[PDB]
């Protein structure tokens, strides 16, 4: 119903100004844009726009009734607004929205399989053992029916037989199969799990509901549960507390060696 690109090519969910400008400058072209929900004033939105001379402007968008208001103008949807300033009128004098910048969506391009049965390896061979439900990255498949894989739960690498696995859909999060990752539970259930089953210094990671591409590290202190934001960069890394990491696993190792909260280290993920 609009001339805008699909929403997932420019909508970043809840995002602060600093990260939004980082993503626009990573994009690099004048006319690049994104829309975010204000982190500081939730329920209101921001059109962030890379102008000439590396300047990023930010335009507030107010959600009034079932519509969106910018500069006093009314739009039925964010898509209509983007279509308007891409193809109908200019946003700044002589400048229009040109290049949507997509949020860093996690993608797994490698083939994955899932164990339908447990398996105990033959000792002193290249086989690896696994539990029912283990997920694997397939690196290659041999014509014996065997595959060279990495088990995501254990990180062991070796041979398994295709008769004991099924295919995994491309849609599943790349962290599926990690022992600390829960890709299906709700925020409420993560809190409940850490309170009932988890112990002090237990933790888990799940995707953010409000920011596409983000993850949340849930951590249990003696008194409460704290949530920390992990944010991807456009450069295949992850950011937490302004520190940069090659993987979420690296974040977990870091906070096993350094205190995440004064007087606390990560101990064990809550069992799954």
């Amino acid at each position: 119903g609009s001339t805008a690109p699909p929403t997932n090519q420019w909508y970043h969910g809840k995002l602060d100004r600093t990260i939004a400008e980082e993503r626009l400058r990573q994009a690099g072209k004048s006319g690049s844009y994104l829309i975010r929900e204000s982190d500081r004033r939730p329920g209101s939105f921001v059109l962030s726009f890379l102008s000439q001379m590396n300047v990023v402007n930010h335009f507030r968008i107010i959600a009034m009734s079932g519509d969106y208001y910018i500069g006093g103008r009314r739009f039925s949807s964010l898509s209509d607004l983007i279509g308007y300033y891409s193809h109908v009128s200019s946003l700044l004098k002589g400048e229009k929205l040109l290049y949507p910048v997509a949020p860093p969506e996690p993608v797994e391009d490698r083939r994955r399989v899932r164990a339908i049965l447990p398996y105990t390896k033959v000792p002193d061979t290249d086989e690896i053992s696994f539990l029912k439900g283990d997920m694997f990255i397939v690196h290659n498949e041999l014509e014996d029916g065997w595959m060279w894989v990495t088990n995501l739960r254990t990180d062991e690498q070796g041979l398994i037989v295709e008769d004991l696995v099924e295919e995994v859909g491309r849609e599943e999060d790349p962290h599926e199969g990690k022992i600390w990752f829960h890709g299906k539970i709700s925020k409420q259930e993560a809190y409940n799990l850490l309170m009932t089953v988890g112990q002090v210094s237990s933790f888990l990671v799940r995707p953010s509901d409000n920011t596409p591409g983000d993850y949340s590290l849930y951590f249990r202190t003696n008194e409460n549960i704290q949530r920390f934001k992990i944010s991807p960069t456009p450069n295949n890394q992850f950011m937490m507390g302004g520190r940069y990491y090659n993987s979420i696993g690296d974040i977990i190792d870091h906070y096993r060696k350094e205190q995440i909260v004064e007087g606390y280290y990560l101990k064990e993920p809550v069992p799954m």
């Binding site: 100004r17 500069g71 704290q226 949530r227 920390f228 507390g241 520190r243 995440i260």
Partner: peptide, 25 residues
């Protein structure tokens, strides 16, 4: 209800009242 910052967080904050928002042409 808010996200927390870790003990070694290195985020240097900026005040919202200083952030300038603009209006379309």
């Amino acid at each position: 209800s808010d996200y927390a910052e870790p003990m070694d967080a290195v985020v240097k904050p900026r005040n919202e009242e200083e952030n300038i928002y603009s209006v379309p042409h």
